[PDB]
Amino acid sequence: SSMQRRDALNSLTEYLPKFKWKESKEKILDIGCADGSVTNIISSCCPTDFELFEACDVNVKSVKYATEHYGTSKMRFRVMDIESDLPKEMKGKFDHVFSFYTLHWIENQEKAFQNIYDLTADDGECFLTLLAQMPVFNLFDALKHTEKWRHWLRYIKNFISPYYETSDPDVVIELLLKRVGFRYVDVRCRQKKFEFYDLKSFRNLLEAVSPFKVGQELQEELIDDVMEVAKEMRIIDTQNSTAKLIYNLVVIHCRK
Amino acid sequence: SSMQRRDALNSLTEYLPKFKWKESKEKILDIGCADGSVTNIISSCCPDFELFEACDVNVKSVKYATEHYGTSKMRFRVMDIESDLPKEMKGKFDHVFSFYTLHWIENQEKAFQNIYDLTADDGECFLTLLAQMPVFNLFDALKHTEKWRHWLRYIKNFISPYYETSDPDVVIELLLKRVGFRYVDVRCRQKKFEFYDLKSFRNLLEAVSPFKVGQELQEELIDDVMEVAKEMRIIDTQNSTAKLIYNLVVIHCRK
Numbered sequence: 001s002s003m004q005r006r007d008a009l010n011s012l013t014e015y016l017p018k019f020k021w022k023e024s025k026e027k028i029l030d031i032g033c034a035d036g037s038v039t040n041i042i043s044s045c046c047p048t049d050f051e052l053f054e055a056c057d058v059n060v061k062s063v064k065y066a067t068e069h070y071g072t073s074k075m076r077f078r079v080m081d082i083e084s085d086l087p088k089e090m091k092g093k094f095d096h097v098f099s100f101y102t103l104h105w106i107e108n109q110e111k112a113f114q115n116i117y118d119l120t121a122d123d124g125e126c127f128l129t130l131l132a133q134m135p136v137f138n139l140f141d142a143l144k145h146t147e148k149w150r151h152w153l154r155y156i157k158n159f160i161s162p163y164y165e166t167s168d169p170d171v172v173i174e175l176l177l178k179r180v181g182f183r184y185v186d187v188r189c190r191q192k193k194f195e196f197y198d199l200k201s202f203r204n205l206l207e208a209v210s211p212f213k214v215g216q217e218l219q220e221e222l223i224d225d226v227m228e229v230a231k232e233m234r235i236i237d238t239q240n241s242t243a244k245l246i247y248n249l250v251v252i253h254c255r256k
Numbered sequence: 257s258s259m260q261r262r263d264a265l266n267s268l269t270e271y272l273p274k275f276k277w278k279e280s281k282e283k284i285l286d287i288g289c290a291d292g293s294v295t296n297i298i299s300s301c302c303p304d305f306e307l308f309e310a311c312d313v314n315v316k317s318v319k320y321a322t323e324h325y326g327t328s329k330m331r332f333r334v335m336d337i338e339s340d341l342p343k344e345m346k347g348k349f350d351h352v353f354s355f356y357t358l359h360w361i362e363n364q365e366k367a368f369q370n371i372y373d374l375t376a377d378d379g380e381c382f383l384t385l386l387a388q389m390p391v392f393n394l395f396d397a398l399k400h401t402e403k404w405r406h407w408l409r410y411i412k413n414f415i416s417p418y419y420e421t422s423d424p425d426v427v428i429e430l431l432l433k434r435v436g437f438r439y440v441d442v443r444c445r446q447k448k449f450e451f452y453d454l455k456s457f458r459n460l461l462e463a464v465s466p467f468k469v470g471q472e473l474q475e476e477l478i479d480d481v482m483e484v485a486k487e488m489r490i491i492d493t494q495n496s497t498a499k500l501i502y503n504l505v506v507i508h509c510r511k
């Protein structure tokens with residue numbers, strides 16, 4: 001989505017000058033590559049010629065789309081769960097580990113952050129972004145106790161950020177990262193705005209980010225009901241036919 | 257408001273051990289004293305303090321506050337931080353505190369410049385500020401309505417400048433460093449406050465409502481704000497509960 005690309009670019013632009021490379025032949029990893037369009041931004045923006053850049057994701061079709069489109073001899077897309085046990089091959093392998101708009105998908109929060117630590121090299125650093133409060137969560141959440149969608153949206157909480165209703169998520173995450181072993185930790189809760197100027201660009205977003213598989217017959221009907229709720233919640237201005245999303249993106253910069 | 261009491265206590269409890277204290281005869285100031293419940297918390301919490309000044313723009317609030325929390329050390333007066341500083345308070349205060357105040361203020365740059373000027377040579381500041389807050393959106397949904405269109409004319413004077421801002425922490429930080437603050441730590445703190453009944457949520461909206469619409473209209477106004485809250489999913493119609501998820505920006509500076 002456009003929202004995810006801007007936040008990726010804005011993040012890298014700011015924190016790029018705070019990273020240390022300190023050598024030649026740098027191995028890099030991105031967690032939750034999806035289509036690989038953001039990974040391309042990370043790979044491209046990074047000044048160095050990385051000997052190897054890996055990018056993982058649990059979604060099989062996404063990895064295939066990515067390997068088919070962005071795959072090179074040094075840009076390898078593999079399947080992997082970051083909640084699962086790491087292979088010994090990757091323990092302490094990566095000079096930089098990246099992960100944007102992914103860690104809010106993940107139940108086993110403590111294993112993920114420990115795996116990210118374990119993945120990072122002795123003198124390595126990590127750069128992670130993830131969603132806290134996001135109105136889109138609330139838009140779908142308002143549909144989970146309705147006859148129409150009650151059963152499709154049963155595993156809703158498995159997709160909503162564990163931090164969307166949390167007090168001082170920055171403090172909770174920072175403590176988690178320090179207890180994991182990271183010698184340097186910096187976690188910020190960044191309030192963001194993203195405006196949509198027509199309703200179609202807002203409907204395009206809701207379609208892209210919908211984790212549900214309601215089919216084709218019901219698929220259009222779901223988004224319509226989400227758009228109606230979005231009018232009631234004032235996330236889309238009915239007078240102007242515009243949409244406004246105000247959300248928190250927690251951005252993390254650690255060093256082993 | 258119970259929401260402001262908690263945030264104040266949580267904010268002080270965390271940052272108290274990070275403050276630097278002078279040996280004796282310290283001058284302290286709290287901006288936006290309001291009723292003085294929070295100012296009494298600030299005073300009661302921190303370690304024989306020589307002086308405790310408080311201020312406000314509301315003349316009735318300071319009069320209320322003086323009678324109930326007035327002492328020889330803790331004096332209250334009227335002062336607009338957006339105005340020109342009285343020269344007697346330049347570099348006078350070793351600690352300056354302001355909670356749930358600086359979002360009320362239009363001239364954002366003079367307010368912070370005045371705070372810096374209020375602060376002593378090696379003094380520090382601890383400020384809290386609202387960014388995004390649903391209560392802002394609740395009233396904002398009544399501004400184009402013909403019923404309230406004239407009453408909520410000056411809505412934007414009371415809504416936080418940072419309520420729709422990208423990276424308010426980066427904006428506020430840059431502003432504070434440019435003022436001349438040597439150390440600046442500004443966090444955007446996501447918060448949750450839960451109301452278990454509609455009465456206690458209704459009570460907040462009444463307390464925090466900045467509109468003098470009068471006895472025959474306030475109730476009718478609150479009712480209409482409560483209905484918008486149902487539509488915006490801030491109150492759960494089923495449980496008869498309410499949920500506020502908002503951003504409090506907390507600021508720790510050294511001059």
Ligand SMILES: Nc1ncnc2c1ncn2[C@@H]1O[C@H](CSCC[C@H](N)C(=O)O)[C@@H](O)[C@H]1O
Binds near residue numbers: 001008
């Ligand atoms: N446990 C897990 N391990 C790895 N990837 C996961 C995961 N859980 C979810 N993901 C993937 O993480 C992705 C989040 S979407 C974010 C895409 C891209 N990284 C960006 O920055 O925009 C999805 O593809 C999802 O399938």
Ligand SMILES: Nc1ncnc2c1ncn2[C@@H]1O[C@H](CSCC[C@H](N)C(=O)O)[C@@H](O)[C@H]1O
Binds near residue numbers: 291295317335337
């Ligand atoms: N320009 C200004 N200068 C000083 N105080 C102001 C002001 N504009 C508004 N205020 C005051 O700021 C207060 C904000 S509400 C009170 C906040 C309280 N400290 C708490 O802990 O919640 C109100 O009493 C209001 O009268």
Ligand SMILES: COC(=O)/C=C(/C)CC/C=C(/C)CCC=C(C)C
Binds near residue numbers: 393
């Ligand atoms: C400074 O304290 C606050 O902002 C606290 C709350 C929750 C609301 C009361 C104050 C303001 C600035 C706005 C009140 C209502 C509006 C609709 C703007």
Ligand SMILES: COC(=O)/C=C(\C)CC/C=C(/C)CCC=C(C)C
Binds near residue numbers: 131137156159208211
């Ligand atoms: C993968 O798309 C995103 O990162 C989506 C964004 C920007 C916000 C919502 C995130 C996702 C994917 C969850 C979808 C919606 C829910 C109701 C949980």
